[PDB]
Design a protein around this ligand. Structure first.
Ligand SMILES: OC[C@H]1O[C@H](O[C@@H]2[C@@H](O)[C@@H](O[C@@H]3[C@@H](O)[C@@H](O[C@@H]4[C@@H](O)[C@@H](O)O[C@H](CO)[C@H]4O)O[C@H](CO)[C@H]3O)O[C@H](CO)[C@H]2O)[C@H](O)[C@@H](O)[C@@H]1O
Ligand SMILES: OC[C@H]1O[C@H](O[C@@H]2[C@@H](O)[C@@H](O[C@@H]3[C@@H](O)[C@@H](O)O[C@H](CO)[C@H]3O)O[C@H](CO)[C@H]2O)[C@H](O)[C@@H](O)[C@@H]1O
Ligand SMILES: [Ca+2]
Length: 559
């Protein structure tokens, strides 16, 4: 296991270890398709009473997350069985899935929630969470089965299984003011602020409304739940796109929020509001073991430094999972799991405080990225991305490495290495933008490899990509491209110990002409022990057509 170490186990419904009398979808890479949008690009379709998928626990479990697709505008159930005995019902719904666009307007992915004439549905999968009153042992047969009264049809994509500890009590009621049936989050924080013996607030097991942005000020604040399966912060679900969560004022730098879940009411992307945590320039804040869904982002840092995001679960958001921008340095984004983000799952955007520096994105998992990349780094200096797992990108690379400025004021990459070290990227890449007049055309889109190295309008230099396994990328393993006419010379771009397995087109693509008016790459890159295995067409494309780009084959290359 590369990536996050999480207490839950993921099993694909379509796994060959699972008996089923339903319909296993043949894989594809199509957005807007129940196979293309599934984890592992396949799911099991249950379509008649009595159809099931039978999972086998490989670890003890009392709790489950079922990723699934149901019809638009429906809510209902699907049944769970343990060793042949019915044990309850998942609450399944398309309330948060189904976002509408057209193949030529994928720029709108995530923004537009209503069906319409000529619109195609995307973002088809969503999740149902269920805890059972018993810990079932490894080897237990857990059956997801469509019974009478359950939904008319359901695509079963994957199952999380987890052995959840009992909820933790208030660590000390004389130091943590408890949220109660009669005392709100806001009221407990007021009592906390006015009593200097309090370290913070404790939010018990339950469902607690967050209908506002809850401001943390006065001093560093501890916000402690009972555990993410127990303490549920819930945005009013009869409202939609309510900007709720926490806002950490500078006075509350050094705060900690942990051991709770937060359930937003966003049903489409909104730019501006919608981050669960607002923390304008916050420092030394710790966000740990929380589980957030249906917000625009978990957090969007702006000159936020020395913070720690650890052990979190970020699922089904409408834009980025975590992004750190405009000077955000020396942060610890460690051991977080992301599935179903609406833009770059984990991103670092360096702008203006010359650069984002000294950040460490470690032990990160980012799957089912419904737009943009699993991991993305835009400029910066001395930033480490280490032990990553990315898989199943709908429209973009597993890893984007870009010195494009997006019109903002940035210097690009700095004089110290941006390092990608230890990464597994399964079925990443996709289609986006347009390729009018493009060389190497296969469709109406630009086509993206597992890792995109993009020289934009700013310096593209000091990039180290090592110890990377790239499995069945949609199109390419590595994709190098320079934006014209800037033609920034790539320097100190090095690739070491990389395996690219069964790319449909090429192991490595030097983009010659992305679209009309665009040219080949400038500079070069070195390759050491880079193996390309079974490319659909050839190992490398574009070398003879890129006369300003020098491929250096140091050693160990089978191409
Ligand atoms: O899913 C990607 C991205 O989309 C949204 O953010 C948009 C943001 O990217 C930008 O749009 C583009 C730039 O990305 C850039 O794209 C050019 C493109 O025009 C194309 O010809 O080819 C190259 C690649 O070979 C692209 O880099 O530049 C153009 C024009 O300069 C921009 O329009 O700005 C738009 C709004 O103007 C954003 O919508 C999305 O929000 C974001 O989350 C996502 O990562
Ligand atoms: O309107 C809110 C702020 O706008 C400016 O800040 C931008 C950030 O909020 C952020 O916005 C992202 C947006 O560009 C797009 O990519 O969608 C993301 C997801 O919803 C947004 O978070 O990032 C931008 C790029 O760094 C910022 O320009 C103003 O500078 C700020 O004062 C406003 O409060
Ligand atoms: Ca699956």
């Amino acid at each position: 296991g590369r990536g996050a170490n999480m207490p839950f186990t993921i099993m694909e419904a379509e796994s060959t270890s699972n008996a089923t009398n339903g319909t296993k979808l043949t894989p594809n890479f199509k957005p807007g398709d129940y196979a293309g949008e599934a984890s592992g690009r396949s799911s099991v379709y249950l379509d008649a009473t009595g159809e099931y998928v039978e999972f086998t626990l490989t670890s003890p479990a009392n709790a489950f997350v079922l990723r699934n697709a149901v019809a638009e505008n429906t809510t209902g159930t699907v049944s769970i069985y343990a060793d042949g005995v019915s044990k309850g019902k998942f609450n399944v719904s398309s309330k948060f899935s189904y976002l509408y666009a057209t193949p030529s307007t994928l720029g709108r992915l995530g923004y537009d929630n209503a069906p319409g004439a000529g619109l195609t549905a995307y973002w088809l999968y969503e999740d149902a969470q269920l805890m059972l009153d018993q810990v079932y042992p490894a080897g237990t047969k857990i059956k997801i089965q469509k019974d009478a009264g359950d939904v008319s049809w359901i695509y079963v994509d994957l199952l999380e299984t987890e052995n959840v500890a009992p909820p933790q009590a208030n660590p000390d009621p004389t130091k943590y003011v408890a949220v109660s049936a009669s005392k709100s989050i806001d009221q407990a924080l007021t009592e906390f602020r006015q009593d200097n013996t309090k370290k913070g607030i404790y939010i018990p097991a339950g469902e607690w409304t967050i209908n506002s942005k809850i401001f943390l000020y006065g001093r560093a604040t501890e916000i402690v739940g009972a555990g993410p399966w127990y303490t549920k912060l819930v945005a009013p679900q009869s409202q939609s796109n309510t900007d709720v969560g926490f806002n950490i004022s500078a006075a509350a730098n050094g705060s900690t929020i942990r051991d709770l879940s937060a359930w937003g009411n966003y049903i489409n992307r909104v730019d501006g509001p919608g981050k669960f945590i607002d923390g304008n320039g916050m420092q030394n804040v710790t966000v740990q073991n929380i589980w957030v869904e249906h917000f625009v982002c978990l957090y969007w840092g702006v000159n936020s430094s020395y913070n720690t995001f650890k052990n979190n679960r970020i699922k089904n958001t409408f834009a980025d999972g975590i992004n750190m921008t405009n000077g955000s340095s020396y942060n610890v984004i460690d051991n977080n799991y992301a599935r179903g983000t609406g833009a770059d799952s984990f991103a670092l955007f360096s702008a203006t405080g010359s650069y984002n520096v000294g950040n460490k994105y470690t032990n990160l998992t980012a799957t089912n990225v419904r737009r943009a990349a699993a991991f993305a780094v835009y400029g910066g200096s001395d930033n480490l991305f280490q032990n990553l797992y990315g898989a199943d990108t709908l429209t973009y690379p597993g890893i984007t490495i870009s010195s494009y400025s997006f019109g903002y004021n940035t210097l690009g990459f700095g004089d110290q290495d941006t390092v990608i070290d230890g990464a597994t990227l399964d079925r990443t890449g996709g289609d986006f933008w347009t390729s009018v007049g493009a060389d190497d055309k296969i469709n109406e889109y630009q086509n993206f490899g597992a890792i995109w190295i993009y020289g934009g309008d700013r310096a593209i230099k000091n990039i180290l990509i090592k110890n990377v396994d790239i499995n069945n990328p949609v199109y390419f393993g590595l994709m190098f491209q320079s934006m014209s006419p800037n033609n920034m010379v790539m320097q100190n771009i090095r690739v070491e110990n990389v395996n690219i397995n069964n790319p449909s087109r090429y192991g490595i693509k030097l983009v010659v002409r992305a679209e009309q008016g665009q040219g080949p790459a400038y500079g070069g890159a070195s390759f050491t022990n880079v193996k390309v295995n079974n490319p659909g067409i050839s190992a490398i494309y574009g070398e003879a057509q890129s006369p300003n780009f020098t491929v250096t084959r140091v050693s160990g290359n089978n191409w």
